[PDB]
Amino acid sequence: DLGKLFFCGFNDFNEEVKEIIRKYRPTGILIYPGVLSKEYLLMDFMSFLSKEGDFLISSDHEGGQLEVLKYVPSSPGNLAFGKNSPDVTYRYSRVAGKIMEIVGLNMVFAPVLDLLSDIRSYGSDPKIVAEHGARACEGYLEGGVIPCIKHFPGHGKARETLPVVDAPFEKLWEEDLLPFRKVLEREKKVTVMTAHVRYSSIDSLPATLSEKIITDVLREKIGFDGLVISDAMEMSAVSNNFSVEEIVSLFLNAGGNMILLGDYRNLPVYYETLVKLLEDGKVQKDKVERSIRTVEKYLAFAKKNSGVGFLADVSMKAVEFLGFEKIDHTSEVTLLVPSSENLSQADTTGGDYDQIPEIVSRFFEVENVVRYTVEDGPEFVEGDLIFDFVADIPNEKALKAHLSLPAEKTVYFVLRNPFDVRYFEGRKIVVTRSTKPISIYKSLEHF
Template sequence: MKNYGKCMVLAFVMIFTLAGCSKVDTMQETRQQTFDEQVDAVVESMTLPEKVGQLVMIGIHGTELNDDSRYMLNQYHIGGVLLFDRNLQSAEQTTRLTAELQGEAQKVPLLIGLDEEGGTVVRGKSFITPPPSAQSLGTAGDNTQAEAWARRTGEQLAKLGFNVNFAPVADVGDSSRDFSRDPQVVKKFVAAAAQGYESAHMIYTLKHFPGIGKGQVDSHIDRSNIIATKQQLAEEDLLPFKEIISQHDTEDFMVLMSHLIYPEIDASNPASLSPEIQTKLLRQEMGFNGVIITDDLEMGAVSKYGDFRQLGVQAVLAGADIVLVCHEYPHETDVYLGLLEAAEKGTISQERLNESVKRIVRMKLLRGNSPR
C-alpha cells in the first residue's frame, strides 16, 4: 500500500508542475524532495480560493459533466464529489463521468466517492454488485467475509474511477447498517473491512463518529441527543474507531462526523460542529491526525439550526477538514463562500487552513489515484 502510494505521488507531482518552473527543473526538484516537502510545495502553490476549495466536497446533478457542474468545480476549486444514483446509469457512463470529473482536478486529484455500504445503502445496483448488509455479515459471524466484500467492492469502485467509499459503518447498534450491538464484534468486523479496502487501494470512511447506534431520531430529519456517559461511549461506541485509528495508516481512511449531540461531551453542539468532540476527543485524546469530514450539512439535524455560510465555518473551526454538501448548488456555493470569507477575514487563520489542506493533499497524493 505504501509503495503504491509513493509511486503515484511522484507521477502526479510531476504532472502538476509549480508555476514558474520548467518541467525539467520541477522533475529534478521533485526527485530531491521528501514527501512532506512535496506536500508543502503543492500547498504553497495554491491560492487562498484554491485552498478553501479543498475543504468542500459536493454532490452534482446529471450523468455527465455539464456547464453547472464544471462551473462549480472550477469557479470554487472544489476538492471532491460524492455521486448518487441520480448520476449513475451504467458502468461505461460512470467511468466516463468520473474521468471527466477528474479531468477538472486542479493540482491534486479530486476525491470522488460513493455510499456503497451494503444492504439498504447501495448505489448503481444494476452494475455494481451490492454487498450484503453489515448486520447480515455480523450475524453470520465470519469477519473474513467482511474483508472479502470490502475488497471486492473497493476493486469494483476503483475500476469505475472512484477513490473513496463512504463505508464501513462503525456504529454499535441494531440497525441493518450496523455489524452488531456488541462493540467487540463491531471492532472485529470494521477492522476486517478496513483491511479489505486497503487491499483494493480504496480510501474508506469510518462513520458516524463518535457513534450513532444509540440514536433515536434520523439526523436527516432533525437533531437529537445520545444519552450515554463518557465511560459508556469509551467502552462501547468509540471502540471500533479506536481500533482503526491505532492500527492503521491515517492516510487510508477518513472519519465522518455525526450530526447528533452528545451531552456528556458537548451539550450545545452536534459532533459535526463541536470542538470538544473533533479537536479534543478525536484529535488530542484519540490521536487521529488524518482527514475529518462532516456528514452532509443539508441534513435537518444541522440545516434547520444554521445558515449554510456559517455551518461550514463552524465545522472547520471545530476541527473538520472537509465539509460535505450533497444536493443543492446554492447551498454548496454558500458553504464555499462562507469559508472563503472567513479565511479572508482571518476567522479561519492561515495556519488552521493550511493544517486541513496539508492533510487533504497528503491523502490525495498517497491514495487519490485509484487504479482502473
C-alpha cells in the same frame, strides 16, 4: 487552495456541474444514482474528472441496504456480516474496493461502525463491531479505495430535529467509541465522518460542530490526525439549527477538514462564506492550511486512474462526421427511432434504441419521437430538425423512405455498419460504430 476543503454531491452531469467544478475546484466528488444509473453519464463524468485534476471520488455503496453501484455484487449487509467471521468482511470489502477502483472511484463512504440498539450496523457488540470495521477498512484499502468510518463518535444510541444521545462519556468511550479507536489505532489511511448528533453529556453542539469532540477526543485522546469529513451539511439536524456561517466556522475550528455538501449547488454559498470567514479572521488561517495539507496528503495516496472514463474516449474516437462541420441549438428535433426487432436475451440493441430519446433530450428539445420498423424505413415527417437513427437498410423500399426526408435538415446516424454511408452520398451523416448510449451521447456533445 480552498476547494480542497469541499466534498460535493452530484446527481447529474451537465454544463452547470462542469462549470462549478472548473470554477471552485472542489476536491471531493460524491456521485449519486442520477449519475450512476446512467452509465454513459458516469463515463463522461469520469472522463472529465480525469482531465480536470486530482479528485477524491466516492460513493455511498456500503452494501446491503445502501447499494448504488451496479458493478459490485450485492451484499446482504453489515448485520449479516456481523454474524460471520471478520475474514469474510475483509473478503467482500476487498472485492468492492477492487471493483470500485476499476470503475474509477478511489474512496468509499463506508464502513458504518455505529452500534445496533439497524441492518446498516455490524451489530450491538462493540468488539465485534470493531473487528469487522477494521477488516472492512483493510479490505477496502487493499482493494484500492480509501474508506470512511461513520458516524463518529457513534450514532447508534440516538433519539429524536437534531437527535440526542445522553450516554455518559465513560459509557460512550467503552461502547460506541471502541470500534473507532480500534480502527484508527490499527489503520491509518482511513477517513472519519462525523455524526450530526448532540451528546448531552459532553457538548450541546452536534458532534460535527463540536471542538470538544473532534479535537479533544478524536484528535487528542485517540490521537487521530487524518482526514475528518462532515456528514452532509444540508441535513436537517444542522442546517435547520445553524447558519452557514456558524456551520462552516464551528466545523473547521473544531478540527474538521472537509465539508460535505450533498448538493453541489450549495458550494458557491459555502465557499464564499469561507472566504469571508478568512477575511473576518473568524476562522484562523492556520486551520485552513492544516486541512488543505491533510486533504492533499490523502489525495497523494489515493489511486488516480481514468476508471471507466476511457470508454467514453474509445467511443468518441470511433465516431465520424460526414458532410458537415456542425449544426446549432434548434429548440426542437424529431427523432426517428427504429423498433427493437431483436428479442434475444443477450442482445442489448433494443434497449439502446429505447434510451435514445432521453439521451438526445440532454442536448435538444425532442418534442417528437416516432418509432419506425427497419424493413419499411421511417414514415415521412416534418420538423425544424430531424435525427434519423439508422440500424440497417435491408431493401430499396426502406432506402427510399430514408431519402424522402429533407436533406437540408436531417442527420442520419449510421449506428451499425459504416458501409451504409454509401446509401447517403452527399448527405449529413454521423457514423458511430455502435448503438450504445455513450457513442450517441458523445456524438451530440460534439454537435
